[PDB]
Symmetry: D2
Subunit: 265 residues, 4 copies
C-alpha cells in the first residue's frame, strides 16, 4: 500500500489546480507570467519579478536561430516527410545536448567550477589552454569585440540593471577581456551569458541555498531553458514547411562521399 511515486510540483486532485502551493487563480492574480510559472514548476519557489522577467527574456532570445542548425534542419526534414507536429519537433529536439544547444549548461558548469576553485580569470584561461580545452560560452562564428551580438547585449543590459549581484557574470566578463586579446571573436556568446546569468540568479536572488542552486545546475535546468525556448522555433519551422507545401527531401548524392570497404577485404 505505500505510494510508489513521489511528486512536488503540481496538485490537480482538488477542485482547483495548484502549482507548487499556489492555486491557479492566485498565479494569475499575482501576474506571475510564464517566468513565474516556471519558477513554481521547476524550482518550487516564488521568484522575484525581475528573475521571472529574466527567464522570459531567455526563452525569447533562444526561440529560434534559423533553419540551418541541426535540430531545426531535422524538424524540417521530418515535416517534409509528412509527419505530425510532435514527431517532427522531437526529431529536432533529440539533436540537443552536446555540440548543439549544450553550451548553456556546459558554460554554467565550467565557469562555476573555475570561480568556486578560487582561480583568477587569467589563470583559468591559461589552464584551459594548457589542457587543450575550449572555454564553453566563449567564441562566435560571426560576431566579435567591435561587432557585438545583440542578444548578448539585450540580456546583459537587463541583468546588470536588475540583478543586485552578478559575481559569475563579472568573472566571465573578465575572462572575455582576456580571450578577446588572443582573437577578437572570442567574445562571451549568448550561451555563455545565459549560463552564467542563470547561476547568478539561482545563487543570489534569495530563493535558493547554494546547495539547491548547485543541484539545479547539475540536474540540467539550463538544458531545460534552451530546450523549452528553442521548441517554439522548431514548432514554427514545422508549421512553415507545411505552409510552404514542401515535399519529401532526399539529400543529393553529389554532397556525399561513399567510401565503402573493398569487396575482397
Amino acid at each position: 500500500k505505500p505510494a510508489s511515486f513521489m511528486t512536488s510540483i503540481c496538485d490537480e486532485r482538488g477542485q482547483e489546480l495548484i502549482y507548487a502551493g499556489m492555486p491557479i487563480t492566485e498565479v494569475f492574480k499575482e501576474e506571475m507570467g510564464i517566468g513565474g510559472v516556471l519558477g513554481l514548476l521547476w524550482f518550487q519557489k516564488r521568484l522575484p519579478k525581475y528573475s521571472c522577467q529574466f527567464i522570459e527574456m531567455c526563452l525569447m532570445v533562444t526561440a529560434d536561430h534559423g533553419p540551418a542548425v541541426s535540430g531545426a534542419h531535422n524538424t524540417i526534414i521530418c515535416a517534409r516527410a509528412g509527419k505530425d507536429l510532435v514527431s517532427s519537433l522531437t526529431s529536432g529536439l533529440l539533436t540537443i545536448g552536446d555540440r548543439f544547444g549544450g553550451a548553456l549548461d556546459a558554460a554554467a558548469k565550467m565557469f562555476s567550477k573555475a570561480f568556486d576553485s578560487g582561480i583568477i580569470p587569467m589563470e583559468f584561461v591559461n589552464k584551459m589552454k594548457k589542457e587543450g580545452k575550449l572555454i564553453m560560452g566563449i567564441g562566435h562564428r560571426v560576431k566579435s569585440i567591435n561587432n557585438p551580438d545583440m542578444r548578448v547585449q539585450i540580456l546583459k543590459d537587463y541583468v546588470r540593471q536588475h540583478f543586485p549581484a552578478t559575481p559569475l557574470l563579472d568573472y566571465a566578463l573578465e575572462v572575455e577581456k582576456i580571450t578577446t586579446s588572443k582573437k577578437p571573436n572570442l567574445i562571451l556568446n549568448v550561451d555563455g551569458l545565459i549560463g552564467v546569468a542563470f547561476v547568478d540568479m539561482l545563487r543570489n536572488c534569495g530563493s535558493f541555498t547554494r546547495e539547491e542552486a548547485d543541484e539545479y545546475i547539475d540536474i540540467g535546468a539550463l538544458n531545460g531553458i534552451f530546450v523549452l525556448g528553442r521548441s517554439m522555433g522548431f514548432i514554427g519551422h514545422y508549421l512553415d514547411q507545411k505552409r510552404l507545401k514542401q515535399g519529401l527531401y532526399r539529400h543529393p548524392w553529389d554532397d556525399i562521399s561513399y567510401v565503402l570497404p573493398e569487396h575482397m577485404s
Copy 2:
C-alpha cells in the same frame, strides 16, 4: 545556378541581428512583445494584438502542468527514474500527446468549426457524431467533470469573454457541452476543446487574418502546438523533481498486470 533545396520564412539569422518574421530582435524587446508576441511572429507570421499575445501566454500558463499521473508526465517520470537525460525524458512524455491525451485541439477546432459552418444545431452535431461512432474531440475528461470543474477552462472563458470581439464558435461549443454534460457528467468541454475553439474565434476575428488564412492555420496543426509547448514546462519540471528526489529505477508491479498468454 543550382536552385535552393530548402525554403524558410520565419527567422533570418544571417545578418547583423536576428529577425523573427517581420521584426528584428531589438524591436521585439523595444515593443515588449513577450513570449506570446514571439509566438505570433514565429508561428503565425504576424504582430498580433496585445490581447491575443496575452491569451497565448495564458494558454501556455494554464496548460503548463496537470500532475504526474497523466500519460506524458508519467512517461517522463519513468525516463527520469531510469537515469536518462532531460531531452530523452521530455521527449518520451511528449510522444504520448495525441488523440486521447493533449492533442485534441486541432480536431476540436476542425469538427466544431465544420458543424458550426454547416448550420446544424448542437444536438444534431452530437447525434451525428454518435451515429458515426466518432468521439467529440475536445469533450470529456477522466477526472474533471460538472462535479469537479476545471478552473483552467473558467480562467480561459473569462478572459476570452472580456477581451475578444466575438466568440461564436465558443458559444456553439458551450451549447454542445450543455447537451453532453446533461447525458454524462464527465463530458465537459475540456482544455483541448476550449483552447481549440477559442483559437478559431481569435484567428477568424482578431483582424490579422483572412478566413482562408485562419482555416489554413487550423488545417496545418498550429493549435496542438500550444499544448505541446505549454505542457513541456511541466514535463521538464517533473524530470527535475524526480532527479532532485533521487528516485530510482521503476518497474511496474506484477499484481497490476493480467498475463493471459496462449496455452
Copy 3:
C-alpha cells in the same frame, strides 16, 4: 484490486522466460530464429518455417538504403551533433510513416481493399487514375520493367517458390503488367511486394482467421516490419559517423531560400 494492465506476449515472472507460451529453451530447441520469435511476440502464433524465413528476408532487404533518405540523414545529423545512439536512432525513426517508409502499409491496405471489393486489376488502375490517386507500392525512382530491382526479384522468387497461395501478390503483378504499359518505371517496388506478400502470409499461412489478418494490417504490423528492419541501418549510420569522426553539421545558407514577411506587413 483488479489489474489495470493486460498483456499477452511474454511472461518473465517464472524461473524461465516464456514468449507467447513457449519457454525460451524451446524457442532455441525448435530453431525458431528471429522470424519465429517475431511470430510469437507480434502475433502469438507458431508460424510455418517458410513464413519465418520470409519475415527474416524482409528485415534483411529493408535494413538500409543509404544515407540520403530522410531518416538516415536525420540519424546522421544527430550522430554528428554528438548525441547518443538511442537519441540518434529515434531522431531518424521519427521521420517514418507517411512519405518515407509508409508505402509498405499503404500498399497492403490499398491492394487489399481493391482485391476484397471484387474490382479487377484493369478497373482498379482506371479508378485510381480518375480519382487522382497514386497506386501505393508501384513506381520507382531509378528501376523499370527491363532494369529490375534485385530486392524485389529475390523476395518475389522466395514467395512464389514457398507460399502455397499468393492471391494478393498475383493481383498486384497483374496491376504491374498494366501500369508498366503507361510508363516503364511503374513497376512493383519493394514496399509493394513486401506489403502484398505479408497480407498473403497472414491470410493463407493457416495460423490466422481473416479477421485476425485484417486486424494486424489495420493496427500497423507492416509499419513495424519496416521500422524494425531499417533500425539496423540507422544504427549502422550512427556508428559509421562516429567511426569517421564526423563533426557538427550546419546546412549551407546557399541551399536555403529565406523569404520572410515584409517589416511593414
Copy 4:
C-alpha cells in the same frame, strides 16, 4: 569543386543493386548471411564467422522481450493506450534505455575490460568500485537473482563456451559475479553484462579485428545497439497487443502517488 559535406561507408544504393559494406545484396542472400551477417556488415564492416553471426542472432532473440512491467515496455504501452502510432510508441519506450535499464552493455564492456587489462583481481575491482561510489555496470537485477536465475544468461553462456575460441573477459566477469552474489543475491551478471563481456571476447578473438579495432567498436557504443535492436521487437509486440486488446487511455492512480508540495 565543392567538397562533399557527408561521408559514409556502410551502404551504397546508387548502383544496379544495393551493397552492404563489401557485399552486393544478391551475394548476401547467396551466402546465407542472415540477419546476423547483415548486422556484421552494416555495423562492423566485416563478413564475420558463422558462429559470430549466429551469436548475434541469439542475442537479438534473447533480448526480444522481458514483459510489460519494465520501463520501456511500460512507456510503449502507455503511448499505445493513448492512441499513438507505432513509431511514436516504440520511440517513447526506447528512450528509457540507458544506464539503469537496458543500456549498460557499453559500460559493462568498458569497466570489465579496464579492470581485466589492468591486472587487478576481481575482488579489487569490486572493492574499488564500492570505494568510488560507482555501480558495476552489467551487475544487478530488480527481479532475477541466484534464487530466480536468468535463462537468457544461461543460453548465452552455453553458446559462448561451446563456440568461442577464448573467453577471458567472460571468465573474469563470472569471478566478479561469484563475489557480488555472495554479498547480495540479486547482484547477478545480468543480460547487459553478459552480452557486453561476451562481445568483447568475440571482437578481440574472432579474427576479423585488431585489438585497436575491437577497442574502437566498444568506445563508439556498438554493443548497446544490440539491446536496442533486439528489444525493439518486443516493444512493437506490446504496441500491437495493446491495440488488439482495445486498451483505453491510462491515467495512473492517485493512491500510488505521494503529493508533497510546498506550504
